[PDB]
């Protein structure tokens, strides 16, 4: 019954092709609810879930003002990081920021986070105490010194423990039909010969929410993790998720193999069998 609110920012430079493109998205759990795209015509924070549409004009104006301000700072950051790393303008670079808060089943604060990456690598992250920073290299130590002297952590901690949690709870209530639901996976296994002597066994989970799930194969009760092909959990497009796991086995041995599904929607974990 645990929940999260997260915001994700990506800014990408495009040398000699204009200013950087900035995209921001916001999620409650695995449900997107807002977006902003600096290239788009509207120049507005836009709704992406039905339950956020009821927020009033002060909300949309304020969310737009804040995200535009972040768009500009991440533009400046791409410049700053080229300076920190002595990089040229021959190539494109990427800054990412992610932040948000988690609450438990009882909706009380669990933990907060705020992390930044440059070119796909950790750059600087707020520690669990929300008071101190982890800087991944020497350039990020420069940022750490500046953020310590500017008391950035204190600002974030007040947001993460306060405002973040309060608005997460508001969204959970307003979007309760979507966000408080659990859709248990509909499960089955498929069998297809790959030759006269081997078969692919594929364990499916469909139509589930939230996206967290575990699918595993056992052979006589022993986990077959090195022999399993496990695909990334994927969106169906309707607010639910899908996932599969496959093993290739000698024909005749199917009854040794079982698939095991764990999900919060299931009253008990399922074991699927070939007998």
């Amino acid at each position: 019954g645990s929940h999260s609110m997260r915001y994700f920012f990506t800014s990408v430079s495009r040398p000699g092709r204009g200013e950087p493109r900035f995209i921001a998205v916001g999620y409650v759990d695995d449900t997107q609810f807002v977006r902003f795209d600096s290239d788009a015509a509207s120049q507005r924070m836009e709704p992406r879930a039905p339950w956020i549409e009821q927020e009033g004009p002060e909300y949309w104006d304020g969310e737009t003002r804040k995200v535009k301000a972040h768009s500009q700072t991440h533009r400046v950051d791409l410049g700053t990081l080229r300076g920190y790393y002595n990089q040229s303008e021959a190539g494109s670079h990427t800054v990412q920021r992610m932040y948000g808060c988690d609450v438990g089943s009882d909706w009380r604060f669990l933990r907060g986070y705020h992390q930044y990456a440059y070119d796909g690598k950790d750059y600087i992250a707020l520690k669990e105490d929300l008071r101190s920073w982890t800087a991944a290299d020497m350039a990020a130590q420069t940022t750490k010194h500046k953020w310590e002297a500017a008391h950035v952590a204190e600002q974030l901690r007040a947001y993460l423990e306060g405002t973040c949690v309060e608005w997460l709870r508001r969204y959970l209530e307003n979007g309760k039909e979507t966000l408080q639901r659990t859709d248990a996976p509909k499960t089955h296994m498929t069998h297809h010969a790959v030759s006269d002597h081997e078969a692919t066994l594929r364990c499916w989970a469909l139509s589930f929410y939230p996206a967290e799930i575990t699918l595993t194969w056992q052979r006589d009760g022993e986990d077959q993790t090195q022999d399993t092909e496990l695909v990334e959990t994927r969106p169906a497009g309707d607010g639910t998720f899908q996932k599969w796991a496959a093993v290739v086995v000698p024909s005749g041995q199917e009854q040794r193999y079982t698939c095991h599904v764990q999900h919060e929607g299931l009253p008990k974990p399922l074991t699927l069998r070939w007998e």
């Binding site: 916001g26 804040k66 995200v67 700072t73 400046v76 700053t80 750059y123 608005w167």
Partner: peptide, 9 residues
């Protein structure tokens, strides 16, 4: 609701 203070790397 996002945070509203800004900072630079």
């Amino acid at each position: 609701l996002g945070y509203g203070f800004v900072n630079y790397i």
